[PDB]
Design a protein around this ligand. Structure first.
Ligand SMILES: */C=C/C1=C(C)C(=O)N/C1=C\C1=NC(=C\c2[nH]c(/C=C3\NC(=O)C(C=C)=C3C)c(C)c2CCC(=O)O)/C(CCC(=O)O)=C1C
Ligand SMILES: */C=C/C1=C(C)C(=O)N/C1=C\C1=NC(=C\c2[nH]c(/C=C3\NC(=O)C(C=C)=C3C)c(C)c2CCC(=O)O)/C(CCC(=O)O)=C1C
Ligand SMILES: [Ca+2]
Ligand SMILES: [Ca+2]
Lengths: 488, 488
């Protein structure tokens, strides 16, 4: 259960103060909803149900032409009001937003800056150098007191891997922050909407009315609203961190959220639409370099584990008993361990326990199998910290802090379990990563982000996605080989 | 009409000599078809209709397990017969192939070689350096007399951009070869099947029988058959080139065929399955570096042309007459030309001709519009060599060798045409690129690939995909703006 993750952040029915929002129906461009501050930004009152005309909205022919083409987002520089206008499509609606235009900016200056970044990335000595250059560029153009790059781990915790700034905020470079600082619905949203900005932590939310959109009969889906009012609890987190403004940018690599470029200010601070879009572009450029590196490594590992797989599957088929493809020689046993980069394995077939390499005792495995028995396992169970959910395991963390466990073969109660040892390491966090407080029925963030150091115990080197896949495929192979052998 | 492009290369009903082929039905693994040389490679006669058993095929339980999992290709090292076995799925069939195994190779040596390439690419000073390193690696592992990298142009002609080898074959580095050397169905096939090998140009094809597959009732689709007998006319091309063996590898970037790693030998030469797969891997690695570079440039250009588009669309909407967004000031006119990187444009609205920048005369444009009038144009007509299909245009190649032409507005006979000048350049081809001979009812390749040099005339700098898109979008915008203005 995750109460943080359950907040419906995409439907707050309000926006921040630095702009206004209008919802139009696609066919007619009839005004279906509006933020309470609309007439202010645009100088004309649009009653609900009324038809936007060119007199109200000088850009409406451009909006019309945009609507029916391919571009996902509308942009229009409304010089007269010094407003930047943006829009997106949602169902049968157009959601239109306006904000103050940038001052003293040009497309041509931003293009030269991004071109230089692209060229630098297109050589790119090293990823580290690519990350620092990208943070420095974003810092230069956004004017924020701090810009960092936040790299997500397999558990959705993250480490600060690059940083630039004015000195007005603390340094978090090299620190880890827990998964729960960005809850899963926020992570999902941030996968599909790559930009956000909070220019003043203490804005007063501006209501969107009417509450119910008459075209849809539901509340407004603000997933792609740039002005969307943000979660109260995140604002509390910002206050606790001492950041009066933020802006972040998703780094999306091969369709998955790789990390964030996160920016903060010690006082209120906004960034123009053109500069936000340039920061997205910068993140995309960086993502291309990251991808080169990520995919080469991943693919190489899959090739490697494929070779080991081919040998195991061949020996399993050639042997009288499939198990001897795993246990029947020194190469077989070495390959068994290498298949997932483990240091040990138990093959448990009914009452026969066969321990290979470095394992817990028979007695420890039997207890572990009883413990596993009581869970639903789709294909494989994997953990890098078995003591975490199975405390009796702390007694054998030196050999089996990490496990991949799975049922195998045609016999219920037969398992293949791979083991990894504890690897102790010192981990420095931005504050106590267990510190969330429950109060008035809600989970609140920690108050301190001061370096919080631990000697991490009972935790193995993490299981990679190629190692998990290889486990799944081995499992599939064992049963398919068996099935076919049985046809005879 | 393209008779070269019409040959059904994926259904020759025969294979090359260096392996054998068996078609199995998926459910039963019943033998549906076989190459005439099968019993030779595998030592057991499989009558058609008969059920493959483990005695015939020791790997059949592995094949069975593979069939029902996710992997696209089967591989099995049949040590006893020193055969490499491969397979793929096609409809309800499995197509299984066997060939001689490699001698004195290891997975671990190939992995170290590819890892070093990946690491080099993951810094990669320059694309040129990446291309040469990749050719050198492929040369090292494949043993071919020559390895080159062949980069496709927008017209599907290609230039040799890297090369390595023994000296036993000529150098083609820096030469261009015409589009018709690889016809469009071959290019399509090579987009989805990234590997091919022809170990001996003078092999005698081995028939697959029966002719009709009884499970499907049609001939065998050999698109993904590695042993497939190849087009006779390509074999003629190889003989003319003096290459007794070849192997090539597609370089696929963002789903499109970017180029080939092409290898040749002056005498017969084969490459093992493991080495072919390593060459595919090498091409994929290279593709990741190419992609970084390609996508950055493309994306930057789209941003740039987007900015110009936003200005044009805004001026078109603000003006009484949409045309003044294009003609109504110095910026408007500059943006009009810049929208597609042109040096000139004609906006022709009924009988009013408005020429901007460097154009042909009114009289020349009027004739051009008559010529255009007689063609079907989906959205835009674009060429980099207008004299090519419109010879009277040679008289104004200095100003309008290249054009993008399109109908615009709500009035039939209204056009926007952008112009580019001739850029003369010296082009060196691998033989006369117009030289194909018709004989006995078929098109044959040239006999000489000796450097063939021309001063290329009547040809502009080529139109890029972002420039074409920008033209299409402008066209869409003009009509949408007009439509909405008209609502009033
Ligand atoms: C019970 C809920 C939450 C706890 C507890 C908590 O700590 N956060 C909780 C919820 C949300 N956080 C949201 C957004 C968000 N969080 C971060 C986190 C970081 N900021 C940093 O500076 C660093 C590290 C140096 C971290 C790890 C960021 C960057 C963001 C995005 C907003 C921004 O750029 O400031 C969030 C969603 C907010 C919204 O979009 O409505 C929730 C619900
Ligand atoms: C009328 C048909 C053809 C003309 C004329 C011609 O010149 N080629 C014709 C047809 C086919 N070519 C096919 C394959 C193919 N072509 C090339 C071309 C090159 N080899 C080179 O060395 C260089 C440049 C240095 C070029 C441009 C290659 C590489 C290939 C792929 C085969 C290989 O690696 O040798 C083809 C299809 C063959 C098949 O797959 O069946 C046809 C029909
Ligand atoms: Ca990561
Ligand atoms: Ca190219």
């Amino acid at each position: 259960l995750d109460s943080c993750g359950a907040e419906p952040i995409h439907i707050p029915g309000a926006i921040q103060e630095h702009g206004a929002l209008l919802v139009l129906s696609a066919r007619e461009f009839s005004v279906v909803q509006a933020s309470d501050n609309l007439a202010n930004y645009i100088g004309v009152d649009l009653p609900i149900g009324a038809v936007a005309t060119e007199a109200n909205l000088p850009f409406i022919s451009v909006l019309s032409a945009w609507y029916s083409g391919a571009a996902s987002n509308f942009r229009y520089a409304w010089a007269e009001k010094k407003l930047d206008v943006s829009a997106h499509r949602s169902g049968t609606l157009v959601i239109l937003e306006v904000e103050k235009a940038g001052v003293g900016e040009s497309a041509e200056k931003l293009m030269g800056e991004l071109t230089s970044l692209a060229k630098y990335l297109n050589s790119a000595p090293s990823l580290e150098d690519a990350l620092f250059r990208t943070a420095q560029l974003v810092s230069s153009i956004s004017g924020h007191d701090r810009t960092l790059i936040y790299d997500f781990g397999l558990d959705w915790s993250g480490h600060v891997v690059a940083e630039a700034g004015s000195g007005a905020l603390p340094s978090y470079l090299g620190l880890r922050f827990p998964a729960g600082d960005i809850p899963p619905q926020a992570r999902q949203l941030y996968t599909i909407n790559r930009l956000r900005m909070i220019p003043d932590v203490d804005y007063k939310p501006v209501p969107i009315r009417p509450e119910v959109n008459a075209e849809t009969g539901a509340v407004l889906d603000m997933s792609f609203s740039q002005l969307r009012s943000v979660s109260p609890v995140h604002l509390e987190y910002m206050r606790n961190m001492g950041t009066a403004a933020s802006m972040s940018v998703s780094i999306v690599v091969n369709g998955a959220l790789w990390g964030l470029i996160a920016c903060h200010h010690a006082t209120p601070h906004s960034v123009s639409l053109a500069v936000r879009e340039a920061c997205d572009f910068a993140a995309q450029l960086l993502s291309m370099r990251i991808a080169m590196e990520q995919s080469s490594q991943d693919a190489s590992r899959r090739v490697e584990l494929g070779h080991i797989q081919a040998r195991l599957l061949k020996g399993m088929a050639a042997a009288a008993a499939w198990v001897d493809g795993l246990l029947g020689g020194e190469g077989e046993r070495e390959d068994l361990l290498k298949q997932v980069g483990a240091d040990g394995a138990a093959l448990v077939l009914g009452d026969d326990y066969e321990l290979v390499g470095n394992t817990p005792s028979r007695e420890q495995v039997e207890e572990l199998i009883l413990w596993l028995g009581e869970r639903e396992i789709a294909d494989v169970f994997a953990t890098d910290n078995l003591a975490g959910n199975y405390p009796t395991a702390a007694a054998y963390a030196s050999v089996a802090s990490g496990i991949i466990a799975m049922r195998v073969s045609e016999l219920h109660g037969s398992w293949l379990i791979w083991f990894r040892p504890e690897v102790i390491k010192t981990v420095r966090w931005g504050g106590d990563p267990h510190k969330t407080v429950q109060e008035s029925g809600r989970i609140h963030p920690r108050k301190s982000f001061e370096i919080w150091k631990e000697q991490l115990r009972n935790t193995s080197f993490p299981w990679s996605e190629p190692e998990l896949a290889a486990a799944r495929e081995l499992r599939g192979a064992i049963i398919g080989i068996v099935l076919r052998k049985t046809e005879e």
